């Protein structure tokens, strides 16, 4: 990224389609963090399947703990195997009734 | 306002007790305005900039 390629900065209103386009998953539980294992709850406000892995090149259960297995998604947890910084650039959404 | 009674002695001779008391009204006001007008000055400067 280089600042010299910016030409304008537009603003506007967002519809529901845009909001569902930004999101990587829907949160459907108020739980945030576990008190025993100190890990994010499933499908909560800190879920790893939605926002991203907590530790570099690690899955949630036991499978992938190495760099060479990057890209593929665990078939049991579904959490992407990638860097840990992606947790500060992804969004979810809440589906109102 | 002005207090009709003046301070007829200098600091070289030494002020009396109530001459020294009625002379503290004028220093508190300066010390308090110094700490309250700077906000107005800074706000005006920010708007100008």
């Amino acid at each position: 990224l280089d600042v010299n390629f910016f030409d304008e900065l537009r603003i506007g209103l967002a519809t529901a389609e845009d909001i569902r386009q930004w999101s990587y998953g829907e949160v459907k539980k108020p739980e945030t963090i576990n008190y025993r294992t100190l890990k994010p709850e499933k499908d909560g406000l800190f879920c790893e399947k939605i926002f991203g892995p907590t530790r570099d090149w690690e899955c949630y259960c036991g499978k992938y703990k190495r760099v060479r297995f990057k890209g593929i998604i665990c078939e049991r947890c579904g959490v992407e195997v990638t860097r840990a910084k992606v947790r500060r650039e992804r969004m979810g959404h809440i589906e109102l009734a | 306002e002005f207090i009709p009674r003046p301070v007829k002695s200098s600091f070289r001779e030494g002020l009396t007790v109530l001459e020294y008391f009625i002379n503290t009204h004028g220093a508190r006001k300066g010390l308090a305005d110094t700490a309250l007008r700077t906000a107005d000055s800074g706000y005006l400067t920010r708007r100008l900039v």
Binding site: F6, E89 | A27, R28, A32, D33
Partner: protein, 1123 residues
């Protein structure tokens, strides 16, 4: 005098004091004695009236009970508060981090009316914190002080205002209770008097008057003298009692069926029933004294009544009409006038006892609902007092007040004076008071009613100026909360010796003379014309014929810190305020010698502070050491006093005590036995005496800088000890338990040398920055998986190790949950004076050391003695503090000694000098009270008769000036210079606590900018105005580099570091993280923000698969580097 072993310090004062200064800590202890209900307070109160000695907790308990349910078949009552013995002495609590308190018990009885049986038993109510002998509390191991609060007293206040358009007069009345709802009457634009019940809308007063039970003819029968009342009656169209009640009920309560019963009950349960309305004691007194209602009958049932409302309406109408005196049927005559809201007769004081009584009241109120509700859920014949009471709310309220509050404050322990002045402090802020920003300019001012009650000089100069003050020396506090001062009563022109304590309300009714008037040694004024203070605070010159009171002494209007400045009346108010504030910042030195010229206030300000040991009874000292003093009393009893050596203060200084008695001396009650931090033989000593020359010198004292000699470093004249404390905990974790040990992971055995056999360092070992104090190892995680987390020494610190304190869970010690061991290490160091340290004097002087010179190149006198400090002459005349040159002259005279030649008569200028002051020996100590001391004629006379040195030489002439030599060239200076002795003190602003630098360290989390502060390696903020300056200079690359790669660019930081280390060129910046966070937040607010390119196609701006290499090996700086 009056102290058994005080040193002899002759005084210049001419007047006589009829009264001695009171105990300076009683403002704190009397309130607590009242609250507890101790016998001494009981006797004291019984002396001046034994009508009803009601304690502080017993009044709350009696205003709580009896407690009945809806039916009225059960009742519960509390009584007889009682305290047990304290759990542990203060030293143990301060050592173990526990609160110093005592158990509290009451007696509760439950009686059921149906059957008749009564069950009474004792009930436990928690631990009550207790006040020590100095007026401080010890909560969780920390010493705290509760400060008094200045509040506006409840009552009825009238106000006047001027119209903006019609230019008329609008009057208002406000009723302010202790707890309840307010009511305000007012006169609006036209002639219609209105009442705003509980600040909502504005209804004509006639509606309320009818609603309270007044016929449409009684108003004319009583209010039949004003036309505004006629106008209000004419446009009323209410004419009805029930109609008015319904109207008020509907207006006040929105959305409910306005039933007549509810309408007629709500009003009677809003201002008249003692459950939701109170005019506590003081409020009723002021209401009865304002309107002139019944006076003399004891006050009871403090609630607002209808007579008060009618009298208020009458008073307001008369005031608006323009009358001066009014009387109500059944009352005494009273004047009609608006009243000031800042007058010290309207502001009262909440002391510690009342502050904690309010919290106890809240706690008991919260418990009462639970107790009352538990009655209707369980079964009778099993209800006992121990089944309706839960003490959780009371303990919660107590613990939430004493900790985590704005009026219980961390104590100030720089030196004895700072601690003694922290109490004796009146604060306007607080819950129920004022605000620091939206304060104003008329409440931060000096009022003529503060004379004798609150010091006008001492106050902060920040944003708290005028909102914090200090009690005067002679003032005390009324039972209602009003401050009083003593006056000496004068009758028929003869000044008597009877003292009476008056408050501002009464002081506005007499004429009070001045303290320094010419008494003729027989009770009559020398000159009839005298300056007196009249009713409205104005001072006028009147013949001495109608006076009826006099001041007890000068210095009666100043506080304790302002009474230690000699020649105070020669300084301007600003510099005097600065000197009073700066006297409380001096750091204790290692010797602490006492001033050569001072005031008489130092001896009492040290005994009453509480940092010295004073004998309790007469006896013969049996043994003395550096640890204890054993005194053998005269009746065969023996007493041993222990001493605290090298004990750390709240602010990191050193607190020490040293015996000053021999092995056979005989002592007396109240005599001083041991010294303290800043004390010398019983007198407060905050600095040192130094030889001063006043002149400009080579530009090294330019703009308030100071030049110092090198003898003050060689001889430890200005040196101090500072102590520091470190902590570490061994807590449990999921993977295992942490333990302090020696088997650390791979680290050189050269650094494991000072550590003893089981962890902690050895006592006496010198430590530097980066050394290990205690060695702790924590399980790392998948054994042998361990990590190093030992306690290190922070940057820039050093010193010996004094003591080590180790607590353990194995030996059953009180520790929090999950911690097995706690270790504290104490490190001390000595500190010499150096460039950058701050010095000051008692007269507002202040500066930093710009240079320290060798002894052999400083100006020296004729006999060869160099000067110690050089002060510039360009700062004296324009700041209007010439008390320092007077102090210099008198200090030289005191140092050298004098002898007035009176062989043939006595000189005309020495007629008023007390004898025993006509001769002095070298190194004498003299006293100059605050507003009557040495005149300039006496100083000029003493300067001309001074003893010579060991040779027949006189170094300083009749003007106080000497001829000096030049230390570098040797040529004498061309003109004489002013030389003397001055008292200098060392402030606690040292350059060792202020230097800081950083190149790379810890960063934040949300935004990746460096952390701030010294505690963690922190960067300096580059604000908005600095950006303006950079943009005005035209520097477009410096600003970009400052804002991207040095602050926020996460990828540019490492590349810049690598380029710098390898010697190549600095690369180009990128995009900071703060902009990305801003875009994320804007999107989260449901806004569609996008960054477009030159032809549309919004940029992705979401990172990518870029170089992820970590070169340079070493961590950029977030943490240190291991071997």
């Amino acid at each position: 005098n009056s102290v058994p072993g005080a040193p002899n310090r002759v005084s210049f004062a001419k007047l006589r004091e009829p009264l001695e200064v009171p105990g300076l800590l009683d403002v704190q202890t009397d309130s607590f004695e009242w609250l507890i209900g101790s016998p001494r307070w009981r006797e004291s109160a019984a002396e001046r009236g034994d009508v009803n000695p009601v304690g502080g907790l017993e009044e709350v308990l009696y205003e709580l009970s009896p407690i009945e349910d809806f039916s009225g078949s059960m009742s519960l009552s509390f009584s007889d508060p009682r305290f047990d013995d304290v759990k542990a002495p203060v030293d143990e609590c301060k050592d173990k981090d526990m609160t110093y308190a005592a158990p509290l018990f009451v007696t509760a009885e439950f009686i059921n009316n149906n059957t008749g049986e009564i069950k009474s038993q004792t009930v436990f109510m928690g631990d009550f914190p207790m006040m020590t002998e100095k007026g401080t509390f010890i909560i969780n191991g920390t010493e705290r002080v509760v400060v008094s609060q200045l509040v506006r007293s409840p009552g009825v206040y009238f106000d006047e205002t001027i119209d903006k358009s019609t230019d008329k007069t609008l009057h208002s009345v406000k009723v302010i209770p202790s707890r309840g709802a307010w009511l305000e009457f007012d006169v609006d634009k036209r002639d219609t008097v209105g009442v705003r019940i509980d600040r909502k809308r504005r209804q004509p007063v006639t509606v309320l008057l009818k609603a309270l039970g007044w016929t449409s003819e009684q108003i004319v029968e009583r209010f039949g003298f004003s036309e505004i009342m006629r106008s209000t009656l004419e446009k009323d169209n209410t004419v009805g009692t029930d109609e008015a009640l319904l109207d008020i009920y509907r207006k006040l309560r929105p959305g409910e069926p306005p039933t007549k019963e509810s309408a007629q009950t709500l009003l009677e349960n809003l201002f008249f029933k003692e459950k939701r309305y109170d005019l506590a004691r003081v409020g009723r007194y002021k209401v009865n004294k304002k309107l002139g209602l019944h006076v003399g009958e004891p006050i009871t049932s403090s609630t607002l009544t209808e007579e008060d409302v009618v009298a208020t309406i009458e008073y307001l109408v008369r005031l608006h009409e323009g009358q001066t005196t009014m009387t109500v049927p059944g009352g005494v005559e009273v004047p009609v006038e608006t009243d000031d809201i800042d007058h010290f007769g309207n502001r009262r004081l909440r002391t510690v006892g009342e502050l904690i009584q309010n919290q106890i009241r809240v706690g008991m109120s919260r418990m009462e609902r639970v107790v009352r509700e538990r009655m209707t859920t369980q079964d009778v014949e099993a209800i006992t007092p121990q089944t309706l009471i839960n003490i959780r709310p009371v303990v919660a309220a107590i613990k939430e007040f004493f900790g985590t509050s704005q009026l219980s404050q961390f104590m100030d322990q720089n030196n004895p004076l700072s601690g003694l002045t922290h109490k004796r402090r009146l604060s306007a802020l607080g819950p129920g008071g004022l605000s620091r920003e939206r304060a104003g300019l008329e409440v931060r001012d000096v009022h003529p009613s503060h004379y004798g009650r609150m010091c006008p000089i001492e106050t902060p100069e920040g944003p708290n100026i005028g909102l914090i003050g200090s009690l005067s020396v002679y003032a005390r506090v009324n039972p209602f909360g009003f401050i009083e001062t003593p006056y000496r009563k004068v009758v028929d022109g003869v000044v008597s010796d009877e003292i009476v304590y008056l408050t501002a309300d009464e002081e506005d009714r007499h004429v009070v003379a001045q303290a320094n008037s010419p008494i003729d040694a027989d009770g009559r004024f020398v000159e009839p014309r005298v300056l007196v203070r009249r009713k409205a605070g104005e001072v006028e010159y009147v013949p001495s014929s109608e006076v009826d009171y006099m001041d007890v002494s000068p210095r009666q209007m100043v506080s304790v810190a302002t009474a230690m400045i000699p020649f105070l009346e020669h300084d301007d108010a600003n510099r005097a305020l600065m000197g009073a504030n700066m006297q409380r910042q001096a750091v204790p030195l290692v010797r602490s010698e006492a001033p050569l010229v001072g005031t008489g206030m130092e001896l009492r300000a040290a005994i009453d502070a509480g940092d010295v040991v004073v004998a309790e009874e007469s006896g013969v000292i049996e043994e003395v050491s550096a640890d204890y003093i054993t005194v053998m009393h005269d009746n065969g009893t023996r007493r041993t006093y222990r001493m605290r050596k090298f004990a750390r203060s709240n602010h990191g200084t050193c607190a020490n005590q040293c015996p000053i008695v021999d092995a056979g001396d005989r002592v007396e009650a109240g005599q001083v036995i041991a010294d303290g931090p800043c004390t010398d033989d019983g007198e407060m000593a905050l600095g040192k005496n130094l030889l001063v020359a006043i002149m400009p010198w080579e530009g090294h004292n330019y703009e308030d800088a100071i030049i110092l000699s090198n003898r003050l470093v060689e001889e430890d004249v200005l040196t101090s000890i500072h102590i520091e404390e470190h902590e570490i905990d061994a807590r449990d974790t999921k993977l295992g338990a942490e333990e302090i040990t020696r088997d650390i992971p791979n680290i050189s055995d050269e650094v494991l040398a000072d550590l003893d056999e089981r962890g902690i360092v050895r006592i006496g070992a010198e430590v530097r920055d980066g050394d290990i104090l205690v060695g702790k190892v924590t399980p790392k995680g998948e054994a042998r998986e361990v990590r190093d987390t030992s306690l290190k020494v922070p940057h820039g610190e050093s010193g010996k190790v004094i003591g080590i304190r180790v607590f353990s869970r194995e030996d059953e010690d009180e520790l929090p949950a999950g911690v097995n061991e706690l270790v504290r290490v104490y490190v001390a160091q000595k500190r010499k004076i150096s460039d950058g340290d701050k010095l000051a004097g008692r007269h507002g002087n202040k500066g930093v050391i710009g240079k320290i010179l060798p002894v052999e190149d400083m100006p020296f006198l004729a006999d060869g003695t160099p000067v110690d400090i050089i002060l510039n002459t360009h700062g004296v005349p324009r700041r209007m503090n010439i008390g320092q040159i007077l102090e210099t002259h008198l200090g030289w005279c005191a140092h050298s000694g004098w002898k007035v030649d009176a062989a043939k008569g006595v000189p005309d200028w020495a007629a008023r000098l007390p004898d025993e002051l006509l001769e002095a020996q070298p190194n004498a100590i003299v006293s100059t009270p605050v507003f009557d001391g040495a005149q300039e004629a006496e100083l000029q006379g003493l300067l001309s008769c001074t003893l010579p040195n060991r040779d027949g030489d006189v170094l300083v002439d009749a003007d106080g000036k000497a001829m000096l030599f030049d230390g570098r060239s040797g040529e004498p200076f061309p003109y004489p210079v002013t030389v003397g002795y001055m008292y200098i003190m060392k402030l606690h602003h040292l350059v060792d606590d202020k230097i800081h630098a950083r190149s790379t360290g810890p960063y934040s989390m949300i935004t990746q900018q460096p952390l701030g502060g010294k505690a963690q390696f922190g960067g300096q903020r580059f604000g908005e105005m600095e950006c303006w300056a950079m943009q005005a200079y035209g520097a477009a690359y410096t600003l970009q580099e400052l804002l991207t790669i040095k602050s926020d660019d996460t990828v540019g930081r490492v590349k810049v570091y690598e380029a710098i280390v390898k010697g190549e060129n600095i690369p180009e910046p990128g995009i900071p993280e703060s902009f990305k966070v801003l875009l994320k937040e804007l999107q989260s607010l449901c806004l569609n923000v996008e960054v477009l390119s030159s032809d549309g196609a919004a940029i992705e701006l979401r990172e990518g698969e870029d170089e992820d290499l970590e070169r340079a090996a070493a961590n950029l700086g977030i943490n240190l580097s291991r071997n």
